[PDB]
Amino acid sequence: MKFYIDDLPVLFPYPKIYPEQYNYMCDIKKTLDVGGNSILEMPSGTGKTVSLLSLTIAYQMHYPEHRKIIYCSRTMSEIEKALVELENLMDYRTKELGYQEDFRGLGLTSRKNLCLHPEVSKERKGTVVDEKCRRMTNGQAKRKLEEDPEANVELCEYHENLYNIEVEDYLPKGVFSFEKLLKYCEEKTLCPYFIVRRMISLCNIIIYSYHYLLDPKIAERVSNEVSKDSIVIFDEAHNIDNVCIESLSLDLTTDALRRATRGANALDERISEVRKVDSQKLQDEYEKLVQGLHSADILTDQEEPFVETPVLPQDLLTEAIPGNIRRAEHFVSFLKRLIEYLKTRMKVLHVISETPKSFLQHLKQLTFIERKPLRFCSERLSLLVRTLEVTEVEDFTALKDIATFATLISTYEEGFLLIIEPYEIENAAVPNPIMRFTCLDASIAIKPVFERFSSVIITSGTISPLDMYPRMLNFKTVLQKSYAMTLAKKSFLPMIITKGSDQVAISSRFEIRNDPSIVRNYGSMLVEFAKITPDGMVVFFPSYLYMESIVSMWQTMGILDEVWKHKLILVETPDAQETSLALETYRKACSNGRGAILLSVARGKVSEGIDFDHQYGRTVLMIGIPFQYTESRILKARLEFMRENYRIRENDFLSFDAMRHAAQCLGRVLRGKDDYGVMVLADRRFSRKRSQLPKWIAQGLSDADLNLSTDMAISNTKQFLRTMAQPTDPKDQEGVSVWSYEDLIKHQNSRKDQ
Amino acid sequence: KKRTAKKNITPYQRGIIRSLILTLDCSEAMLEKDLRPNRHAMIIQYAIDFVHEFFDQNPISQMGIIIMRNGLAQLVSQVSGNPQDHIDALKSIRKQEPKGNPSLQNALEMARGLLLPVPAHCTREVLIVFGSLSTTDPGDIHQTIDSLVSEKIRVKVLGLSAQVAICKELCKATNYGDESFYKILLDETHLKELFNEAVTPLPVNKINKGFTLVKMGFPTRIFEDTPTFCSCHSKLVYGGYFCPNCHSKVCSLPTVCPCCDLMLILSTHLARSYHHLMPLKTFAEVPTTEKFRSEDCFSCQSRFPXXXXXXXXXXXXXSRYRCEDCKQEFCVDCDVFIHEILHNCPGCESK
């Protein structure tokens, strides 16, 4: 299609369009005109990516100013979905117009999946794979390689052929999807990691996980050339406020404290051994500290940086000498004085949430170490370690967390919280204290990204209401509007099973345990679906531990064989590797004749990134209300902070947040308007939260569907499937919800110009 | 408010000389009380109807039957041109009851090799009656899917009031990638029409393939009764026929000769396809007022056509189904029955 929004061609890759899309198209350009925030709700059943990319890509190719576009998704899995979608649209944009791209657009996932060196790629741990190639292709290791001819230092050689051919230009013209990128890079024996690392200043659009925008330790290479005058795009960003606070979160364990002593004592050996050999550089680095923060070679580091910037990207940084901490022996001494004080603060017999100030003052009372120099731990460690040119990190892995933490808490106050549990309640009565620490307001990290740009886009099919987030992140949008699914057919049956076959108000809030009155009713309720439902059916527990709780007794119950006698059952596994193998086989079985049934957690990772088409998404299950206070009052602590900071209480936020995570899972049942699937839910309180739903979801929910019985619901979904299974192809009223190819959008919307 | 196909793209190559072995499920799934006796017994009732009608509408085709019981498929009828052997088989199968589960792949391959001896002109096709939601496959179905499509055998199947994506894919995969063959039921009459539309040949757009001529002869009836003697069954036949070439006393059968193996047919089967080959356009219901034609039926004598300004009775409609080619009307009862039974448009027949 090629229509206009009164200013720009719209090279829409599909012949068909949708009424939401043009309304989506109407607002995106309108928002694009006035760079703001404009939080909008677009139904996930429609593919917003097409409406997303098409108007934006044209906008850059029509308006000649915004040469850089930024999209931040939740998962790199979404990135490759966007990567091919852009690639297809880029092909289509060329297809409709010829060759008018000259465009650079690539994803960004990690070094782990982009380090093409097989040995480094073979390693499992993401830290090591990063660290290995960091060491394998290091600014100093290559010196140990180039200056001293030796086999001691090897290289990825992908970074080298990067420096040979790749660091003169870009990859020729492709908008490389991850498969296409990896296929190309491997044939060029290239490193897509270092490629995008240097391609930061070259990609006309960049797609990556929110963390590269959010996580300052990886949101630190930010170049204002691609950032300042760019547009920021967010979808499904509702479950990111937690991520933001998670990005500032930090859990500690006395074992790691001993690991810290393991590293910190090893530092004493490391600094002493080089001191006998070459302390002159260390003395020279003291002068490099005497001149300042040694930004000459603590930032100008091709592959040198040991400690990254865990704090926000150098906003709250001082650069003077650290007084006496200039000496490494002194530097470790306060650190060694600290870790034991930390241990002395870790050994608390009960749970204590210590204020950042009082705890710091308490430290000062115990170990008189000043706050401002304490932030220098991160820079000093990154500085010192490379000067030590250590050959290992595992002993020092605990240390960078301290360099993270000690800088963090010394930088952060009255927006963060240090809390020292004496153990974990799930394994209480044993000594396992955690010195848990995190932020409280998510907007704190959002404020710099708020500050840096005006044109920012946020979208979700789940966000409801669209007002908590402006309250939460303390910002003003332009358009706070929700889109409804223009469907002339049901295509999904929202079902609230408050009452079971027993007509019992059934819930997950009662306990995190089993009661067969509710549970066996649930088990009996579930099995009838296995017979009637086709391949594709998933459950979402409120908690993984709660998930396992119900599993064993149902396994003990005879309920287990019949569903196997009906379909295939695949579990959620703590390792995603087995889970992935389950997932593909589940989809394979879903693609296969033998039916497949799944089971997950509403907080599980599947609800985060994994979508399911018509066949793959057929019958979603919400196992009770997804609730999170199974854990401690750290939720309440932030919530109490939330309650005092914002006039939002627990349950209101909880219902908002729980249904947000509930709706987070439910968005994965749909692929397009061709897709469909009944949306069953089983909890007594589900009837109350009819308002908390997103509009189209709430619109799709009739009031007659509340507190339904499973038996009556079984009849309800019974007819739905056959009707949907029936080839409902009117081909005349479809154009009402299709806005027939290049005509109705041209005709109707231009008619609707009044 | 009309439920009609916009146009009928019949005009050319369809499935006429057919080799269909429909496969049934005989499982606990067919045992359940979804239909009044059950699925299976009503289905066996339903299935019986099509057999003769298949041999009625398509006497030029051959057919056997296979079922699937207890995770295993079982052939239950030989591919033949006589309904009776197939017909009598179901009577035992009627008195037989479905059991266990169906094995799709067992049916997949048992039927697959079953259709190997079929000639090219005899069109290979399979239809499935399935009630469960999962299969019983000894191996890779997609391999068998690959094997079947490599054999160039399009297939339509009809599951129960539900959908199976691979079955939706299979009917797609079998039929040149065109998915119009996984239609499922929602009602017994809606199931009855499935039989009714099944007897029709299958034109969509046949790829330009090798088209083969056919040579045979007509049979010549035997007259004597007391001379009872048979050769195709070594019996005594109180009346029979004679092969055009082998010249064997053969009982009444439009089948192939048993001695020199040539098809024996008189005239009837041939013209059955002809009205199928070139059907008519539906008699267009002429308007209530814009027609203003003779106030009577054309094929029949239905003087009443509307109600003449009778509020809504006349504003309802006008039973004026008019064939376009003849430009002559027909009462709906006449016109529908015409297109139902005998195309033979008298207005078009008269010239």
Ligand code: SF4
């Ligand atoms: S040089 Fe490239 S391929 Fe080798 S480990 Fe480093 S990033 Fe990976």
Ligand SMILES: [Zn+2]
């Ligand atoms: Zn005989």
Ligand SMILES: [Zn+2]
């Ligand atoms: Zn003969």
Ligand SMILES: [Zn+2]
């Ligand atoms: Zn008539």
Ligand SMILES: [Zn+2]
């Ligand atoms: Zn006519």
